[PDB]
């Protein structure tokens, strides 16, 4: 019975670790048209049918907010954005003082005080020649110099550059694969909570496609909740942590710019072409977004029914307007059509829930110069796009903040917030983890090595 | 009794594939002096002993115009060019205007208007002071503002130049395959643009290669073995350029009779500018030199070869170029560190039929170089003092066949093929890269011994 | 009966070669703060047990003045400094002319005319606007165009400064041979730079060495074991510098007697610039004090060591340098984040024949052309407050004057503006070899016929 420990190689092993992700795209389908920032110049093509393997007898812990792929890919997209803007054109000579007047032609009454026409002293392509250049601007990007002449917001700060209009900003569903010697695990739970074991476990070598959508309060055109509306957070007690929401059923979002915008081209220097807004044809109409109301409270009723599980089942649940702060979390933003939108979700949550004709509109704002991410050391100017844009988009989740100071476990209210897109990527990738497989192994048995 | 397959490793197999290549220099003989663009003044040298190995009983299929080594080498040459140009200074400020007057006195009556004296009111190396410089300019490099003139390329991408000690002359550059790859070449005396090669050979690494830039006549290429050779993707198609190579050298001479001087100009701190100074002596146009009887004999051989694939009674013609941009109208080469432009119509003014000793060519100089077809790059050559004199060989021609020519008679050709990928294919027409699979199997009488 | 040569593996062999070494820092001690210029953010931590063994009855020939790790090291400092400088800002707009005035705030009479009020029209946060802001500069970094001055180095390579959070303090660097290579050292404490070493030993990684920046005297590194020793490629040719290594340290204080004030300006977006502000209090010349007794007795030790290779009873003199480029002219070093320049002339006014402190002035410059290169330059950021510096002097680099007669009355001057000496003064113990584990030898082997 004097057993000997003996070598075994190639045995499956799980051990948590971190390695660099591998890009992946379905047969490089993005090559059909050029060009996209997220698809980049190139990424590796992949098999359209990765082999899903569901594991019998296997349960495994899956913990959100402890994942590191999330911030790794956060770095990946910030680097991609910087690299994409790198070959483009700097725009510093554009922020001399501007002589402006109020635009009042063919404009709706609520639309006054928004569109502005400015002229300024900017040279020509030639070294010694100056040209007079005019374009239509929005107030949200310009500030007064004195208490008139006007200047845009961001020449206190880092330099300004232009987005190259030859590459689109539309998101691309992105696949990810593990390095050699690794695999990605998929939790098969339908009602899985944020932490703890997953009684049904499966694995992949590559993950499905994820759209790098940028939104601040509303999960847009992502995945659906498979059975019921889902709520997640690190700790419900801690109000400083954000509240994830995942919808069982989506309702579309329609967002268009009714005004027919026009564009002009200006020269700065050798190989420096600038694009700016021309005169607008038609009556100036504010951008809006419409969504059905009946679906809206039905979904909030489901959300509140799920909410009451984690509180007293006889409290009062109310929703409200954002507490304030900077506009990026004060309002909702999205990129539809290659340009950004700022809409007021204040009236979205105007309702109160007690124990026991069809679509509503939201006015929206438009911004050209954008402090992308939270970054303060860089800035960009969005190129104007002519015509009339249109966006159709689902809704796939909410992101919420819970008020503090509550007592007696009654009268709970919630507000949108937490512009950390890390939350968005958690709400996308939260079905996967990275694990290292150790082929080595030494176990006792009855084998004694043959005598020399 | 039934045979079993067994395993072989290290067996010879070639497969069509593609991989990146390496530098290989002639023992780094240039290391004694600085600087050359094409060698970066340094890469891995090579031994003088690669052994060509004839492949008896072996035939091989080759194909030009689809093998990619030519294009990879083209993009490598572009990368070498802009890499050698990156560390040296730009020339942004000169897109200013120019007041100009014609160069007068001590001039040939035929050059009148070629050179222009323009001055600048530009600033100094110190940012608060203004100065006045003057320089000499070719007429081709400048365009009038509306006398006053402006540089032709300031409504396109900026032009960069500095840093003149660097040389442009070629060095023989080789390319050795990566481990697991080899080089194959075709041994026959005469070979089409495509087809099997009855006798083939393999080498570890290629011979000396020149990256020389030619527009309308091949220069310094290896001589044809037996006779004038004609190639193209398909002779019938008239969108494809035709290849011509010479069995016997045709020698040319080119020189710049003017004694030129160079001035040092300062515009920005740590930035040296060089412009052509006042020319010493009488102004005389630069020219080239080619023999008469030789040119007759070469064109006679060319038309005799052309008679093979066409009706033997067809009338052959060559002519004046068709026009367009100078890079294909004229003939251009950089010999002597200077780009030369001139006009081969004097050499193609002829026509053949069935069954003193030299010619002069008026030639031009351009200081602004939109090298290749790029629009985002530009360079201004440095003025070279003294008188430059060039000796060279001509070994090939690139022509285009005009349309029409109905009823199979009166065939004409005009110069073309302004893409130097044709030059590099006309060099590399000999070499192909293949893929080695050391693995393999085969049947045998052997079965694995038990235990 | 006849032998048969047979292959053996694992055979230890040494042979001269060269590769690139491994960066090694002591247990990543610098990771606590961001970040040293040399250590940067990343290298391999050292082995906590740098095991050393004495070679059993082995002697080896060492050839210093022929080592190549010294030049590899020199290139490595060059690369590290350029890498640190690269993600920083350019100061070309400062090349505009500066009007300057001679302003003193209770200055000392020996300090008059060294610090100037200079100002320029500068740029603003907007290219449309200009504003005049003054600053204070040393007399070294300016020049009269024909008062009005300009930066001394605007007729050469550009001036670049930024990134003040880097630390200029050296850290010892270990170096480990790559796989298949080894490092060999000489135990003999009296060993030359060259010649065979009777007592040799091998190490995996050489001991940590500070990237000491000095020109005239070696600072703040290793000591000679049992006496001072002197080395030179050939004691005959005068073109070679004379190395001196001390066995006992010499303590040094150097200080700047005034606090410093710093103001920041924004020449452009992301282009904050730090300049010297007004200095309060009395203006006193920076200088150094050092004990006299140690100086003269250590010089006596050095003369006793030096007399060995001459025929004795020969006069030995040291003297004021002959001048030249300021880098070799004055003793320069950095401490407290500021570069120094000191006149060691007063240290050597004495001759030698058979049978409690000293002061010396110094100087400060802010535009430094690193090493002998002229294509790169840097502006030092002002360091706030009073700089206090303590250090040990571990050696001296010397040069011998040519001429004289009768092999008598030998005179010496400091020299050797090549910091290669600074690195080799400690790299001269170590040497690298290649190991070929394969080996063959005859034996009675006859492989079993099958």
């Amino acid at each position: 019975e004097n057993l000997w420990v003996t070598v075994y190689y190639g045995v499956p092993v799980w051990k948590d670790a971190e390695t660099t992700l591998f890009c992946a795209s379905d047969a490089k389908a993005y090559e059909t048209e050029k060009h996209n920032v997220w698809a980049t110049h190139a990424c590796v093509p992949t098999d359209p049918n990765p082999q899903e393997i569901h594991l019998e007898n296997v349960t495994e812990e899956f913990n959100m907010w402890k994942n590191n792929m999330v911030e790794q890919m956060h770095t990946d997209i910030i680097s991609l954005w910087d690299q994409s803007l790198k070959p483009c054109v700097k725009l510093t000579p554009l922020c001399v003082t501007l002589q402006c007047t109020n635009v009042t032609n063919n404009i709706t009454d609520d639309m006054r005080g928004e569109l502005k026409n400015c002229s300024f002293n900017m040279t020509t392509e030639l070294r010694d020649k100056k040209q007079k250049v005019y374009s239509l601007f929005y107030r949200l990007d310009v500030v007064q110099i004195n208490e008139k002449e006007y200047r845009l917001i961001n020449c206190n700060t880092s330099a300004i550059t232009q987005a190259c209009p030859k590459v689109s900003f539309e998101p691309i569903p992105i696949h990810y694969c593990a390095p050699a010697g690794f695999a990605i695990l998929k939790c098969k739970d339908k009602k899985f909570n944020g932490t703890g074991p997953c009684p049904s476990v499966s694995t992949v070598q590559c993950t499905h496609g994820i759209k790098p959508v940028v939104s601040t309060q509303l999960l847009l055109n992502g995945s659906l909740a498979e059975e019921e509306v889902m709520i997640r957070s690190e700790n419900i007690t801690n109000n400083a942590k954000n509240i994830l929401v995942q919808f069982n059923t989506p309702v579309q979002i329609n967002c268009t710019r009714p005004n027919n915008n026009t564009r002009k081209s200006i020269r700065i220097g050798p190989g420096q072409a600038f694009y700016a807004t021309g005169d607008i044809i038609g009556d100036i109409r504010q951008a809006h977004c419409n969504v059905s109301k009946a679906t809206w409270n039905e979904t909030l009723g489901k959300v509140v029914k799920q909410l009451r599980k984690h509180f007293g089942n006889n409290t009062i649940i109310r929703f409200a307007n954002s507490s304030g702060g900077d506009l990026e979390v004060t309002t909702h933003s999205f990129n539809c059509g290659g340009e950004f939108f700022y809409c007021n979700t204040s009236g979205l949550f105007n309702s109160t829930w007690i124990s026991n004709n069809d679509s509503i509109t939201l006015p929206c704002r438009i911004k050209q110069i954008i402090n992308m991410w939270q970054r303060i050391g860089q800035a960009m100017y969005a190129p104007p796009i002519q015509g009339v844009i249109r966006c159709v988009s689902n809704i796939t989740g909410l992101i919420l903040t819970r008020d503090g100071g509550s007592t007696n476990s009654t009268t709970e209210t919630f507000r949108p917030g937490g512009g950390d897109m890390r939350d968005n990527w958690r709400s996308e990738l939260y079905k996967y983890k990275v694990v290292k497989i150790e082929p080595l192994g030494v176990a006792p048995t009855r084998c004694k090595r043959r005598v020399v | 009794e039934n045979l079993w397959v067994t395993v072989y490793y290290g067996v010879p197999v070639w497969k069509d594939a593609e991989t990146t290549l390496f530098c290989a220099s002639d023992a780094k003989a240039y290391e004694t002096e600085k600087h050359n663009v094409w060698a970066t003044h340094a890469c891995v040298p090579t031994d003088p002993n690669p052994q060509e190995i004839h492949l008896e009983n072996v035939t091989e299929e080759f194909n030009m115009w689809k093998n990619n080594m030519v294009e990879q080498m083209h993009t490598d040459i572009i990368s070498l060019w802009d890499q050698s140009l990156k560390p040296c200074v730009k020339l942004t400020p000169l897109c200013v205007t120019l007041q100009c007057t014609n160069v007068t006195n001590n001039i040939t009556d035929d050059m009148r208007g070629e050179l222009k004296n323009c001055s600048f009111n530009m600033t100094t190396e110190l940012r608060d002071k203004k100065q006045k410089v003057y320089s000499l300019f070719y007429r081709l490099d400048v365009v009038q503002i509306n006398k006053e003139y402006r540089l032709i390329n300031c409504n396109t991408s900026a032009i960069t130049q500095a840093c003149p000690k660097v040389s442009f002359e070629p060095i023989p550059i080789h390319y050795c395959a990566p481990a697991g790859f080899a080089i194959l070449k075709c041994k026959d005396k005469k070979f089409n643009g495509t087809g099997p090669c009855p006798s083939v050979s393999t080498v570890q690494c290629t011979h000396g290669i020149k990256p020389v830039v030619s527009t309308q006549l091949l220069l310094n290429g290896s001589l044809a073995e037996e006779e004038v050779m004609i190639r193209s993707e398909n002779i019938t198609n008239n969108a494809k350029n035709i290849l011509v190579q010479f069995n016997t050298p045709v020698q040319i001479n080119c020189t710049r009779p003017n004694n030129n001087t160079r001035k040092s100009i300062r515009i920005g701190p740590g930035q040296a500018f060089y412009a052509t100074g006042d020319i010493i002596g009488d102004i005389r146009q630069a020219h080239c030199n080619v023999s008469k009887a030789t040119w007759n004999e070469t064109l006679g051989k060319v038309v005799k070869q052309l008679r093979k694939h066409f009706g033997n009674n067809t009338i052959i013609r060559f002519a004046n170029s068709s026009g367009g941009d100078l890079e294909v109208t004229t003939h251009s080469f950089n010999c002597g560190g200077e780009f030369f432009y001139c006009n081969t119509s004097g050499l193609f003014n002829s026509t053949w039929i069935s069954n003193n000793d030299s010619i002069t060519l008026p030639c031009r100089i351009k200081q602004i170089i939109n090298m290749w077809q790029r629009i985002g790059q530009a360079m201004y050559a440095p003025p070279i003092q003294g008188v430059i004199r060039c000796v060279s060989n001509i070994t090939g021609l690139i022509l285009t066949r005009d349309g029409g020519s109905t009823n199979s008679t009166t065939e004409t050709f005009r110069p073309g093929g302004g893409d130097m990928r044709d030059n590099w294919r006309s060099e590399l027409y000999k070499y192909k890269v293949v893929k080695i699979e050391p693995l393999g199997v085969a049947p045998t009488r052997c079965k694995r011994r038990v235990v | 009966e006849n032998l048969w040569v047979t292959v053996y593996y694992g055979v230890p062999v040494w042979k001269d070669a060269e590769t690139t070494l491994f960066c090694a820092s002591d247990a990543k001690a610098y990771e606590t703060e961001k970040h040293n210029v040399w250590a940067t953010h990343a290298c391999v931590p050292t082995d906590p047990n740098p095991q050393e063994i004495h070679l059993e009855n082995v002697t080896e020939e060492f050839n210093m003045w022929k080592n190549n790790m010294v030049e590899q090291m020199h290139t490595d400092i060059i690369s590290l400094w350029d890498q640190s400088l690269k993600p920083c800002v350019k100061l070309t707009p400062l090349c505009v002319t500066l009007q300057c005035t001679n302003v003193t705030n209770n200055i000392t009479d020996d300090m008059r005319g060294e610090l100037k009020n200079c100002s320029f029209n500068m740029t603003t946060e907007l290219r449309d606007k200009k504003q005049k802001v003054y600053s204070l500069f040393y007399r070294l970094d300016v020049v009269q165009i024909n008062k009005e001055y300009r930066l001394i180095n605007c007729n050469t390579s550009a001036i670049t400064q930024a990134c003040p959070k880097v630390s200029f303090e050296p850290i010892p660097i270990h170096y480990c041979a790559p796989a298949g290579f080894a490092i060999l050292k000489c135990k003999d404490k009296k060993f030359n730079g060259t010649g065979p070493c009777p007592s040799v030993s091998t190490v995996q990684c050489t001991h940590g060495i500070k990237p000491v920046v000095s020109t005239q005297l070696l600072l703040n590194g290793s000591l000679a074991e049992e006496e001072v020793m002197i080395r030179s490629e050939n004691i005959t040719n005068n073109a070679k510098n004379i190395l001196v290594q001390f066995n006992t340290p010499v303590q040094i204080n150097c200080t700047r007697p005034n606090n410093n004030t710093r103001k920041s300006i924004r020449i452009g977006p992301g282009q904050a610039f730090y300049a010297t502000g007004d200095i309060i209090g009395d203006i006193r010349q920076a200088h150094c004090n050092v004990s006299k007794a140690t100086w003269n007795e250590t010089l006596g030790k050095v003369v006793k060591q030096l007399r060995k290779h001459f025929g004795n009873n020969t006069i030995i003199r040291f003297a004021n340098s002959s001048g030249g480029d300021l880098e070799v002219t004055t003793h320069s070093f950095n401490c407290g984040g500021e570069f120094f320049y000191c006149n060691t002339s007063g240290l050597f006014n004495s001759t030698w024949i058979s049978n409690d402190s000293i002061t010396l002035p110094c100087r400060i410059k802010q535009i430094i052309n690193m090493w002998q290169r002229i294509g790169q330059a840097m502006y030092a950021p002002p360091i706030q407050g009073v700089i206090r510096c303590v250090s040990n002097i571990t050696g001296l680099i010397l040069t011998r004057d040519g001429g004289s007669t009768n092999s008598t009355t030998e005179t010496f001057r400091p020299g050797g503006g090549d910091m290669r000496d600074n690195w080799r003064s400690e790299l001269y113990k170590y040497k690298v070899v290649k190991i070929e584990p394969l080996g063959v030898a005859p034996t009675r082997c006859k492989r079993r016929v099958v």
Partner: antibody, heavy 140, light 112 residues
């Protein structure tokens, strides 16, 4: 209106130097270009000198080079003229006045990594309210 | 650059339109097209006064009877319905090129 004050009439010997003064209420010199104009009875008008309202640029008639100078007090509340080498023919009336100008850029090099090269051109707009003037006569 | 005014003086019949002429050696037009010319009338016994500035528009408070014209090098100043309070001396200035100068002057006087 801004009040202008000038020195009184003076009798001076030939070949000597003469000093004069001027003053404007409210220190309008900061906002208005300084000028100095002579006129002789029965002849046309000639400008002698000028000083910018910023006090940054000055100019003299080429006939008066080496004999005149431009001065002002601290704060530019007053201005003083020194006239040298005067003979009997320089006897005339001397006037202190303000004016308006145009400060416009002529040439410019836009610099990506520094301030633009710039040169300005000063061009007169109009000559503003005159002073009462001063009469200077030269005699033995 | 030199400038001329013509005529030196002219008799005037009261209540009748009249014109004055000023000429210069070089064009007054600026690279931006701006003209730099202002006419000034000086009463004997007092200082001149601006009439028209920069060849386009009369000065503030100037009666409509004044009118200016001309371009480049030649310019004219026409006054309609001249009366007794118009007798005096008229000057054209220079504002394009340093140094700034004035014309030789024209004298308007009632005919007698």
């Amino acid at each position: 209106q801004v009040q202008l004050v000038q020195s009184g009439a003076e009798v001076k010997k030939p070949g000597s130097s003469v000093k004069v003064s001027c003053k404007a209420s409210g220190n309008s010199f900061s906002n208005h270009d300084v000028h100095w104009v002579r006129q002789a009875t029965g002849q046309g008008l000639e400008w002698m000198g000028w000083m910018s309202h910023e006090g940054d640029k000055t100019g003299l008639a080429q006939k008066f080079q080496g004999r005149v100078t431009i001065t002002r007090d601290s704060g530019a509340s007053t201005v003083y003229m020194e006239l040298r080498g005067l003979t009997a023919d320089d006897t005339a009336i001397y006037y202190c006045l303000t004016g308006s100008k145009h400060r416009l850029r002529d040439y410019f090099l836009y610099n990506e990594y520094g301030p633009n090269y710039e040169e300005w051109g000063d061009y007169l707009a109009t000559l503003d309210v005159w002073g009462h003037g001063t009469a200077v006569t030269v005699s033995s | 650059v030199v400038i001329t005014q013509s005529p030196l003086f002219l008799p005037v019949t009261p209540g009748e339109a009249a014109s004055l002429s000023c000429k210069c050696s070089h064009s007054l037009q600026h690279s931006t097209g701006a003209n730099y010319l202002a006419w000034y009338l000086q009463r004997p016994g007092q200082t001149p006064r601006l009439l028209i500035h920069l060849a386009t528009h009369r000065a503030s408070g100037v009666p409509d009877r004044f009118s200016g014209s001309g371009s480049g090098t030649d310019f004219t100043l026409k006054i309609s319905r001249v009366e007794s309070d118009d007798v005096g001396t008229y000057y054209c200035m220079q504002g394009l090129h340093s140094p700034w100068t004035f014309g030789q002057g024209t004298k308007v006087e009632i005919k007698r």
